[PDB]
Amino acid sequence: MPLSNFEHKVITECVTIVLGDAIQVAKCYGESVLVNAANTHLKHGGGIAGAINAASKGAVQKESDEYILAKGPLQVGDSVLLQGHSLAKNILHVVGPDARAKQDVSLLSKCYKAMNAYPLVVTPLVSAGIFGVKPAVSFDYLIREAKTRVLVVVNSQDVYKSLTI
Length: 165
Ligand SMILES: Nc1ncnc2c1ncn2[C@@H]1O[C@H](COP(=O)(O)OP(=O)(O)OC[C@H]2O[C@@H](O)[C@H](O)[C@@H]2O)[C@@H](O)[C@H]1O
Known about the structure:
The protein is α/β, with parallel strands linked by helices.
């Protein structure tokens, strides 16, 4: 019943697409890992990264800064599991390829594979906004790689229906 107050559709045995705010979906599941669509330096912009940071009152950005000081920047396709900040059990910061920077879009395979370590994942379509990848392409990589329970959350009905037609 958590998904009763969201428009949703089962796509595969692993993957369900959901209309809404990924942050609000993750909050319905205590055991969820929320995916952040990040960049290599975890400097969070106006996309879901900014929404996540704002919800955490800046704690996520500060935590990110400390991680990057200690370990250096992530490579495209990499991820790091950090604190949930009461948004989820944990937040998995994933670095999708940036198509505007002519990066290799197939690195989305590595992004989504990283999610399989967790029993329940709530994720946006990585790279499908500021990083300029078509939502259908990001979606196709997700369903190729998914081997755990994934709620893929899109905040646009246009996007939702384009992927459920
Ligand atoms: N709360 C949300 N819930 C669900 N989907 C969302 C949400 N917020 C944004 N989206 C949608 O998730 C998709 C991924 O959006 P982005 O946040 O723009 O992610 P990405 O394309 O990977 O760009 C990453 C870059 O944006 C910066 O915010 C981030 O710091 C990084 O530099 C897009 O379709 C976006 O519209």
